[PDB]
């Protein structure tokens, strides 16, 4: 019958690894690099679009950076279509929490929920896992500014600075070298762009190949603002930091 054609997506190898998870991670290593850096006064998200065209409408385009709510955003590395399925689920979870408790969802609770959904596809159902790694940038009044990552296995961890996608080994070494705890957002903006500039597979880093976002308490008094940078604004910050 049908058993003949079943790939068995949820089995261990003899070494105790999950085949499909490992192969999904291999897929993600070819995606455009995304970086997150956490500072005392905010968080930076920077990400590289994959080999673009001059005829691509950039100002209406979104493939890397997504808003989950007013306090939490994500950077994507992997299959964009897979990511949008999970993103919509996360947006709904955040609203469910807000309706139930009348408070914004704490960052970790949202991260744990999405990660549990990823885990399920590795243990039951016989379906392929989601080929996506997320960087979560968010703020709540318990832990303040927070950075997380999750991968197809459904495992998640917290970070001061982190990269996903292509050239993470090189990127992480550069971040580990220049990152300091008392760093500020404007310094973190520069570090993120400098790291992408060195790790990129492209010839030069220009505005049309980047997506950028900051989460600042640089919002008038005790509140948080998300800023998804416009193409012209990415062009200006590239000149300011002296990359173009």
Q: Which residues are at the interface with another protein (CB under 8 A)?
A: 1-3, 6, 8, 10-17, 38, 67-69, 91-92, 95, 98-103, 106, 108-109, 112, 115-116, 118-119, 122-127, 141-143, 146-148, 153-162, 172, 175-176, 179
Q: Distances in Å between the alpha carbon of 84 and those of 53, 154, 157, 232?
A: 23, 17, 21, 26
Q: Which residue number, 28 or 38, has a Cβ lying nearer to another protein?
A: 38
Shortest Å distance, C-beta 13 to another protein: 7
Q: Which residue number, 19 or 202, has a Cβ lying nearer to another protein?
A: 19
Q: Which residue number, 12 or 182, has a Cβ lying nearer to another protein?
A: 12
Shortest Å distance, C-beta 242 to another protein: 25
Shortest Å distance, C-beta 102 to another protein: 4
> How far is residue 200's CA from residue 48's CA, in Å, rounded to a whole number?
8
Shortest Å distance, C-beta 203 to another protein: 29
* Cα torsion 238, 240, 242, 244: sign: positive
Q: Which residue number, 229 or 238, has a Cβ lying nearer to another protein?
A: 229
The closest alpha carbon to 117, from 148, 140, 146, 151, belongs to 151
| Backbone torsions φ then ψ of 154, nearest 5 degrees | 90, 10
> How far is residue 17's CA from residue 26's CA, in Å, rounded to a whole number?
14
């Amino acid at each position: 019958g049908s058993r003949r054609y079943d790939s068995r997506t949820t089995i261990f190898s003899p070494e105790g690894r999950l085949y499909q998870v490992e192969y999904a991670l291999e897929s993600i290593s070819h995606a455009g690099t995304a970086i997150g850096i956490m500072a005392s006064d905010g968080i930076v998200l920077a990400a590289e679009r994959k080999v673009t065209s001059t005829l691509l409408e950039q100002d209406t385009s979104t493939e890397k950076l997504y808003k989950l709510n007013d306090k939490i955003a994500v950077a994507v590395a992997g299959l964009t279509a897979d990511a949008e399925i999970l993103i919509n689920t996360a947006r709904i979870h955040a609203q469910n929490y807000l309706k139930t408790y009348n408070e914004d969802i704490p960052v970790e609770i949202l991260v744990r929920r999405l990660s549990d959904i990823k885990q399920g596809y590795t243990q039951h159902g016989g379906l392929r896992p989601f080929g996506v790694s997320f960087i979560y940038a968010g703020y709540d009044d318990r832990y303040g500014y927070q950075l997380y990552t999750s991968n197809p296995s459904g495992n998640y961890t917290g970070w001061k600075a982190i990269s996903v996608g292509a050239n993470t080994s090189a990127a992480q070494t550069l971040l580990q070298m220049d990152y300091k705890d008392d760093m500020k957002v404007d310094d973190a903006i520069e570090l993120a762009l400098k790291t992408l500039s060195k790790t990129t597979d492209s010839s030069a880093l220009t505005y049309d190949r980047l997506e950028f976002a900051t989460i600042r308490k640089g919002a008038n008094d005790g509140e948080v603002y998300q800023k998804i940078f416009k193409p012209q604004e990415i062009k200006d910050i590239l000149v300011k930091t002296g990359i173009t």
